[PDB]
Design a binder for this molecule. Structure first.
Ligand SMILES: [Ca+2]
Ligand SMILES: [Ca+2]
Ligand SMILES: [Zn+2]
Ligand SMILES: [Zn+2]
Ligand SMILES: [Zn+2]
Ligand SMILES: [Zn+2]
Lengths: 542, 550, 111
């Protein structure tokens, strides 16, 4: 009507896929278009992506895609979205930088309009304008966003914590306060860490903890962290340098992040601090610092190979100290444990866990979330970037801060928020969903495919194959059983004796034979094996 | 030897399968014979079990199987062991009780000798004797074990914590102290919680926390915990009763635990405290207490059905309070989160986490483990019941308590410890391993089979089948492609059609050579199909050719 | 030690003012009590089997709380005697009680 619409195509009720939109009449601003990693249950899948059908049926209106920060769950689905619409993209220097590299691997670099913005840029459209304010997060150069529309102003926090002693440029509190004063129709705030009451430890503190390790450790330092945390990488290098240590880098994403961190200016280091892979074994233990990936136990990554049997250039020598400057993402806890066990078994010493202060969340806890709420004055409030419980708890925070429960909307992907100064409500849905990605396939693999993968994976299969030349109705080869994932000579006989009685009979079509095979083999296997393999007959006419 | 041997057939380098043995000459005492639950990566599997080949090749010598406590990871593999050897079993009243029920489901109840022992029993053999001492753990009626042998005494802690204000019978500290004085050659101590420096909170404290919830909650209480924790179940019932609430039970294991807890005497409750499933919806919110399973998010369990769509008799009404009187076992964290999200979405209120004091470990932390070490005087020390790191840290605890690092043996399943007053060492291996169980099939499965399921589950498969020859070596049928899990047939019938042609044109050029043989054809099919699919699809299906000679 | 908190603060202020660096407090692990806490006290109680129990070496509240520890460990409240200086405990296998006083007090020493 005469209101503004706000909605998510992904990012609500989940961590990942974060793609949000604000739409006013014929103009529509997109915020983020990330990717999501498949939960274990989606057997073959590589990535998950939002259903863009609405954005497609409305491409003409899309005025731009803006990028809060450069994390995969914000930036990662952009190649896939750009295959289905061609729209202009705006972001900070680091996000655009990372997306550039990404669009090469996909080819779509040539034909997309990449825009780099900064604190002070405003991009105006007919009846809609977009401004920015700096925040703090687990990656450099992160912005929140203000979308001005007639009915009022919408604010997107991006992903944020508060850090009063940051490694990077301090979050713009002055500007956030202004934004609230100027008036704010609705706030989309990061809900991820809303269950934690504590105030997020400062990166300054982990830096201190890093330097402390570098002074105490007598041998090699193997330091595993997240490639995307440029500032943390900076602290590690400094520690290494300031302790007369050289740095070897392991992992395409690590090299890739350091390279882009170096250009662009987040990483500065002297001359011969960096070292080549062969050079390691030469120098003394206490001058080597290996900086790799695999802090989540992912078994293809650097650290896991180093521990788990062997990697090429690096082996664990007793006295080595490995540092997990991370925290296990849910479900990776077993992976990480395995790695740690191996490292210990291989004689290393491990520094992991919370009692050592070598990690912090990139997402603010309750006090930080409430600081946002009291810097902006949202008439209305929509929790984003979290599972249901994170959204719920976030809302308790907002009601506790005075905003009425009837002005708080905990939503799902696809629901739409009708926003106007004197009224707001969930006014209906939009086409939404999840779209799967295995190999070069993009939405190419349905559920009916995944049910097969599941069935296979629990039970196995047994293939019954026969050649029959059905003129004098005779079985001229077989039946042969070939099985996988199931464990059959007795069965090969059962299905033979019986298949012969079925040919003598002879009024035999094709589908009835497949059925006669299945319908008499299955129960015999179940009898013997209490299992239920996928049994599938193949007939050859010869 | 003139030494005693000590070893594990499972339970080291892992949590689960706990089966340990002490052997002196021709006599050999077993302690525990548990089962283990499959890590996600073992696709089809139901349970894992130790390789008993050594126990089999030596059945005559086995003098008995003794049972510390009655947890599945200690008692659960016994039906499977008893299929391959018939030996006498000894245990406390609760363990034997639970194993009895178990042996019915398996049939082997008729033909096995179940023995019930208590604190004060000694079972003697030619040159070997077995005694007991009470400990505290997350299940009632738990014992530690002392195996006396000529070369010296071996002590097995079972699973233990320390609780000075327990719900059950207090751990026998006096007797532990005596055992150490009397002399101890080697200690096998529970390593599971060795990474935690803190002192384990007492069950008394959770009971208090339970009663507190029962006073504050205005509506229904849905209380999810571990069926095997009879004493915790007792505290829940008391709270319910003492607050004029009735108790509805949900879960076969929950009913089963309460029943055996009731008989045997761990659970006592008045008249009409227990309620039938239909009776719930009748009475007022604040008089209903539902006591179920599914605190780990297991999707077939009671609580999960209640939240996740629907269960039969029970739905979530706003105002309901669900209590997770548990802590998420590693890897179940995602399951539990889902459940909690649903519960919240369904208008419930949830009490989960550590800041509310509604759970404790059944396994002692560092101070407790050190108390053991200073009650027993082990010449030598062998950490048991934990992953490698837990064993390692446990050893640091032992060295810190003065026992020399060269007397501490962190071992793997199968390694054997030669023990004698003046010398000890890992003196060689024994046949050991893991035996998977799917269906009614023990070791019906191999690691090759799991590789197949793994390959199958991610990639799919494509079967290429051909009939060949009149002895003329011509292709008389095919090649036909039939695929599953690889691509949506109902739509890729375009892709696999091109492939059906590729493999035909090429397979014809291969038949006009006779510089070829059976294995070379399968390879020629695979080696030329695979890359084409990868080209088109970037997936890598398991491609397997079947040839028929006609 | 209670009541010395102001003394210690003054010293620390001066030290800081004089350009020193001070390591004080509980977050650095540079001190422990010489006296066990509740779990330790309960370990005692379960190593000895006291028919009867008398809390010593503490202010009233410390005696009281100590007794809650003993009752929690199963020893009956009527077998626990929180006493004052001078009271006397009549102890015999089948009976015990505070059976009267003795001359007691504090003698000050000045000079
Ligand atoms: Ca794949
Ligand atoms: Ca199965
Ligand atoms: Zn982020
Ligand atoms: Zn994010
Ligand atoms: Zn146990
Ligand atoms: Zn156990």
């Amino acid at each position: 009507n005469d209101q503004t619409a706000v909605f998510a195509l992904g990012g609500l009720g989940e961590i990942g896929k974060n793609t949000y939109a604000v739409q006013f009449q014929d103009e529509i601003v997109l915020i983020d278009a990330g990717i999501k990693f498949p939960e274990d249950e989606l057997l073959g899948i590589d990535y998950v992506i939002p259903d863009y059908t609405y954005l497609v049926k409305n491409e003409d209106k899309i005025k731009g895609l803006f990028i809060t920060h450069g994390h995969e769950d914000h930036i990662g689905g952009i190649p896939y979205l750009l295959r289905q619409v061609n729209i202009p993209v705006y972001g900070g220097k680091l996000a655009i930088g990372l997306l550039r590299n990404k669009l090469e691997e996909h080819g779509l670099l040539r034909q997309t309009k990449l825009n780099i913005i900064g604190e002070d840029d405003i991009v105006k459209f007919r009846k809609t304008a977009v401004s920015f304010f700096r925040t703090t997060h687990s990656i450099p150069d992160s912005y929140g966003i203000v979308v001005k529309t007639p009915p009022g102003n919408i604010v997107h926090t991006g992903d944020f914590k508060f850090d009063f002693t940051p490694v990077g440029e301090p979050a713009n509190l002055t500007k956030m306060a202004e934004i609230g004063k100027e008036g704010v129709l609705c706030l989309l705030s990061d809900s991820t860490n809303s269950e934690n009451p504590e105030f997020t430890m400062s990166e300054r503190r982990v830096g201190e903890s890093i330097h402390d390790i570098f002074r105490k450790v007598d041998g090699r330092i193997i330091f595993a962290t997240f490639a995307s945390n440029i500032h943390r990488l900076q602290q590690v290098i400094e520690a290494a340098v300031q302790n007369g240590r050289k740095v070897a880098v392991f992992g395409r994403s690590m090299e890739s992040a350091i390279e882009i961190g170096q250009t662009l200016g987040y990483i500065n280091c002297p001359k011969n601090t960096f070292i080549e892979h062969n050079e390691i074994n030469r120098m003394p233990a206490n001058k080597v610092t290996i900086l790799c990936t695999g802090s989540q136990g992912e078994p293809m990554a650097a650290l896991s190979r180093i521990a788990n049997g062997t990697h090429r250039q690096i082996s664990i020598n007793p006295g080595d100290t490995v540092v997990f400057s991370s925290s296990p993402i849910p479900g990776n806890t077993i992976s990480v444990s395995r790695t740690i066990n191996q490292l210990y078994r291989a004689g290393a010493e491990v520094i992991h866990g919370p009692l050592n202060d070598i990690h912090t969340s990139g997402h603010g806890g309750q006090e930080e979330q409430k600081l946002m709420l009291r810097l902006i004055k949202p008439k209305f409030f929509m929790p984003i970037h979290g599972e249901y419980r994170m959204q719920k708890m976030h809302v308790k925070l907002a009601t506790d801060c005075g905003i009425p429960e009837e002005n708080c909307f905990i939503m799902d992907n696809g629901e739409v928020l009708a926003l106007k100064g004197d009224e707001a409500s969930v006014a209906g849905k939009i086409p939404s969903g999840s779209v799967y990605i295995d190999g070069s396939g993009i939405g190419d693999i349905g559920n009916i495919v995944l049910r097969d993968r599941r069935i296979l994976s629990e039970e196995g299969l047994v293939i019954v194959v026969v050649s029959i030349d059905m003129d004098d109705f005779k079985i001229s080869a077989g039946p042969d059983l070939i099985s996988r994932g199931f464990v059959i000579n007795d069965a090969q006989e059962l299905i033979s004796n019986h298949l012969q009685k079925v040919m003598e009979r002879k009024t035999t079509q094709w589908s009835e034979i497949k059925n006669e095979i299945t319908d008499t083999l299955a129960p015999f296997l179940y009898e013997k094996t209490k299992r239920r393999p996928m049994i599938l007959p193949i007939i050859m006419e010869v």
